[PDB]
Design an enzyme around this catalytic site. Structure first.
Site, PDB file in Angstrom:
ATOM      1  N   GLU A  11       8.677  -1.078   0.556  1.00 52.86           N
ATOM      2  CA  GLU A  11       9.763  -0.767   1.490  1.00 52.86           C
ATOM      3  C   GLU A  11       9.543  -1.790   2.485  1.00 52.86           C
ATOM      4  O   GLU A  11      10.724  -1.799   3.335  1.00 52.86           O
ATOM      5  CB  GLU A  11       9.168   0.523   2.529  1.00 52.86           C
ATOM      6  N   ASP A  20      18.865   1.485   5.050  1.00 53.40           N
ATOM      7  CA  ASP A  20      18.057   1.174   3.749  1.00 53.40           C
ATOM      8  C   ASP A  20      19.067   0.950   2.844  1.00 53.40           C
ATOM      9  O   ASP A  20      20.111   0.683   2.863  1.00 53.40           O
ATOM     10  CB  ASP A  20      17.254   2.354   3.963  1.00 53.40           C
TER      11      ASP A  20
END
Ligand SMILES: *SC1=NC(C)(C)N(O)C1(C)C
Ligand SMILES: [Cl-]
Ligand SMILES: [K+]
Length: 163
Positions: A11, A20
């Site tokens: 991440e 994202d």
């Protein structure tokens, strides 16, 4: 290696609101804020999550605090889900991390929908599960990460995350 180090690799760490891989506002270590296209909505979510009026920027300690909550939430989502809990219980600790990783990225409901993959995992048919897991929007949209997670299900080792 462990689930925290694994997801920190997958991440990243960013201290300002960003989008994202799906275009959704996020911060920290993959902390999804909202699917709304409104940056103001995302900032309100951040303030509520942190408990203060932010400027869209948090500290590393704050990012790690959300991250610990999010890992916890992923595990609790697995344990409360009638489809995911038996599979989780059946897995070794390394493959448990792989399943937590999937739930962190896609949510409890999404991963619970992988009915046939889950069955192959519970059967410990690792290569067949690997082939089945790749026939997915997940694999096609994030193939390098999905390959690391699938390799972890295949081998039960951390080879996909070392070096
Ligand atoms: S998947 C995968 N990763 C490594 C390189 C450890 N492998 O040997 C596989 C199982 C092909
Ligand atoms: Cl298949
Ligand atoms: K990310």
């Amino acid at each position: 290696m462990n689930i925290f180090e694994m997801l920190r690799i997958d991440e990243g760490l960013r201290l300002k609101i960003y989008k994202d891989t799906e275009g959704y506002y996020t911060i920290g270590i993959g902390h999804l804020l909202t699917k709304s296209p409104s940056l103001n909505a995302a900032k309100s979510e951040l303030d509520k999550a942190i408990g203060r009026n932010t400027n869209g920027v948090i500290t590393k300690d704050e990012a790690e605090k959300l991250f610990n909550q999010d890992v916890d939430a992923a595990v609790r989502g697995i344990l409360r889900n009638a489809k995911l809990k038996p599979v989780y219980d059946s897995l070794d600790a390394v493959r448990r991390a792989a399943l937590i990783n999937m739930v962190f990225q896609m949510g409890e409901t999404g991963v619970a929908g992988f009915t046939n993959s889950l069955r192959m995992l519970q059967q410990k048919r690792w290569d067949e599960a690997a082939v089945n897991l790749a026939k997915s929007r997940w694999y096609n949209q994030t193939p390098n990460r999905a390959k690391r997670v699938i390799c972890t299900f295949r081998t039960g080792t951390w080879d996909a995350y070392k070096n």
